[PDB]
């Protein structure tokens, strides 16, 4: 209910802010969106045994049979006389010119299990279908359609840092490399440095690091049966888009030291907890407010190549609050300001 209230407040406050050049979504609004997605996942975690997917696909968050049974979706659609639902019906891909419209459209399409065209992600008659190609194509098409639509809006309104990442359940057996080489093969404009940089950073990282890395994994997440293995440093945008939080279950497979950023402090810095032992790590610290919650993990090791070592820098591992100071490209990346940071597990 608190997440829905925060969502309403964000939509009401950002309904007139026009999407312009060098605009970005604030940390508070990103945390609100993240909490909405997490509560939508948590409302119906598992699936009923009567209608179960033999492939292990998360049908409980993609099928209309489970969306309409989800109580969080019903409460979101009937919070205040369907005011959010009424505004949603007058929004499409080629008409959005405001930040609140962008957020409402993307989040409501995610939580209702519908694409931007209007079709559901996976139909109710294909829950128990054993055809792997059909379900895989549907999931990949849903994720690619979300990312494409965001990049199309980025090209049309000439914005640079608008980013609502596809959640973790829309990456079931979906190759990140294929997504990058299918979205950026056409629309060469997408390659411009002034159009869609955060989406480019999100897709490039998932094209070089797969969901499962077998024995090369140095870190693993787990949230309601969805897992993801990381070998490099995990920036804030990756965890924000995928939907994982630093307060979830984290499994260390190596003795390399990690820096789990949890929250911001009053000295314009970030507070982190350091772990350098094998085991299951779950941060005991209290969850901060939506304006002070940061999800980023940095691997302090030298085994990673210099080709992708720029992801571990402080100014790019955590998205800057100022829109013009957001660093996403490898060339524009700095590691400064560790004096402002602090340690919480002393």
């Amino acid at each position, epitope marked *: 209910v608190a997440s829905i209230t925060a969502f309403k407040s964000m939509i009401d406050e950002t309904w007139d802010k026009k999407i312009e050049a060098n605009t970005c979504i604030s940390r508070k609004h990103r945390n609100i969106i993240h909490e909405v997605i997490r509560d939508f996942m948590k409302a119906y975690p598992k699936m009923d045994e009567n209608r179960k997917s033999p492939l292990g696909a998360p049908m409980q968050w993609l099928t209309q049979y489970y969306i309409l049974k989800n109580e969080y979706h019903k409460t979101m659609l009937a919070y205040d006389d369907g005011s959010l639902n009424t505004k949603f019906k007058t929004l499409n891909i080629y008409m959005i010119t405001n930040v609140g419209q962008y957020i409402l459209y993307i989040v409501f399409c995610i939580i209702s299990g519908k694409n931007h065209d209007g079709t559901p992600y996976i139909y109710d008659s294909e829950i128990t279908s054993n055809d792997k190609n059909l379900i895989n194509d549907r999931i990949k098409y849903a994720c690619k359609q979300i990312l494409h639509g965001q990049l199309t809006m980025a090209l049309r309104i000439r914005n640079k840092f608008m980013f609502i990442g596809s959640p973790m359940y829309l990456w079931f057996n979906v190759n990140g490399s294929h997504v990058y080489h299918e979205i950026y093969d056409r629309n060469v404009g997408f390659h411009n440095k002034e159009i869609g940089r955060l989406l480019y950073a999100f897709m490039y990282y998932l094209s070089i690091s797969g969901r499962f890395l077998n024995d090369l994994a140095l870190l693993k997440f787990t949230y309601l049966g969805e897992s993801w293995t990381f070998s490099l440093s995990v920036p804030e945008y990756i965890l924000y888009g995928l939907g994982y939080s630093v307060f979830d279950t984290i499994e260390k497979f190596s*003795n390399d030291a990690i820096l789990v950023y949890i929250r911001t402090n009053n000295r314009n810095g970030y507070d982190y*907890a350091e772990f350098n*032992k*094998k*085991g299951i790590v*779950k*941060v005991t610290e*209290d969850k901060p407010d939506n304006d002070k919650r940061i999800h980023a993990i940095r691997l302090i090791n030298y085994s990673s190549d210099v080709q992708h070592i720029h992801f571990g820098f402080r100014n790019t591992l955590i998205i800057d609050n100022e829109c013009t100071s957001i660093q996403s490209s490898a060339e524009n990346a700095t590691d400064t300001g560790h004096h402002q940071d602090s340690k919480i597990n002393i």
Partner: antibody, heavy 121, light 106 residues
Framework: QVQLVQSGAEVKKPGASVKVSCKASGYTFTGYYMHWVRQAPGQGLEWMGW????????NYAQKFQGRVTMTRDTSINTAYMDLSRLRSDDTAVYYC??????????????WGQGTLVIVSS | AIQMTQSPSSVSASVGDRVTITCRAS??????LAWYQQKPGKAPKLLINAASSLQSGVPSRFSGSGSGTDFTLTISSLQPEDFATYYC?????????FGQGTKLEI
């Protein structure tokens, strides 16, 4: 030295309730998970759940669901476990086990002293 | 629940021998296995975490190995203070199920 002093042995009756305390010293009570593992006489170890002292959240086992209420009082660094509807098979040495490292929900070290809760008529 | 089964339930040995304890899991539990040591009348003591890492204070004679559903605890040279009951502990899936126990006797 990390110490976990527990309460004395309690001779309860069937259908009653037992509250086993666990006082911690030598380490920061918040930040380390407190687990509760019992050992029946002549049997192995059974896991009951963990309690996070900093937040207050808990995760009980399905076998001990609806009967265990793990509370904490951070003013005395004391951990409390309450077990209701004591049957005859609940007689065991209830240990409180701190996590082996800071916010590590993997292994238990140390294990305290133990409380011989004898449920008999 | 992932049941843990320990094969050598009673392993007689002498001072200066090599003892092997095997703990097989019903389902894959990754590298998340913890070995304990419980002398009679005392609380259990952790000796090896993550199935290959020795805890601080544990003598170097203990050495663990294994992955998936096969694990092994090895004592290079047995000592008179190593005669106790040893337990496994998986942590991949809740609840954390222990083992039956293996006891060393002279």
């Amino acid at each position: 030295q990390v110490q976990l002093v527990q309460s004395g042995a309690e001779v309860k009756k069937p259908g009653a309730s037992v509250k086993v305390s666990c006082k911690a010293s030598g380490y920061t009570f918040t930040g380390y998970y407190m687990h509760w593992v019992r050992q029946a006489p002549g049997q192995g170890l059974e896991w009951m759940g963990w309690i996070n002292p900093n937040t207050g959240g808990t995760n009980y086992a399905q076998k001990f669901q609806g009967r265990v209420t793990m509370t904490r009082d951070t003013s005395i660094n004391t951990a409390y476990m309450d077990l209701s509807r004591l049957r005859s098979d609940d007689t065991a040495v209830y240990y409180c086990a701190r996590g082996w490292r800071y916010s590590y929900l993997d292994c238990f070290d140390p294990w305290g002293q133990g409380t011989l809760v004898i449920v008999s008529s | 629940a992932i049941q843990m089964t320990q094969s050598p339930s009673s392993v007689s040995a002498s001072v200066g021998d090599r003892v092997t304890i095997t703990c097989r899991a019903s389902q894959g539990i990754s590298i998340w296995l913890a070995w304990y040591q419980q002398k009679p009348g005392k609380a259990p003591k952790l000796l090896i975490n993550a199935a290959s890492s020795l805890q601080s204070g544990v003598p170097s004679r203990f050495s663990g190995s294994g992955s998936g559903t096969d694990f092994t605890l090895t004592i290079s040279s047995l000592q008179p203070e190593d005669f106790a009951t040893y337990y496994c502990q998986q942590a991949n899936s809740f609840p954390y199920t222990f083992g039956q126990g293996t006891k060393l006797e002279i």
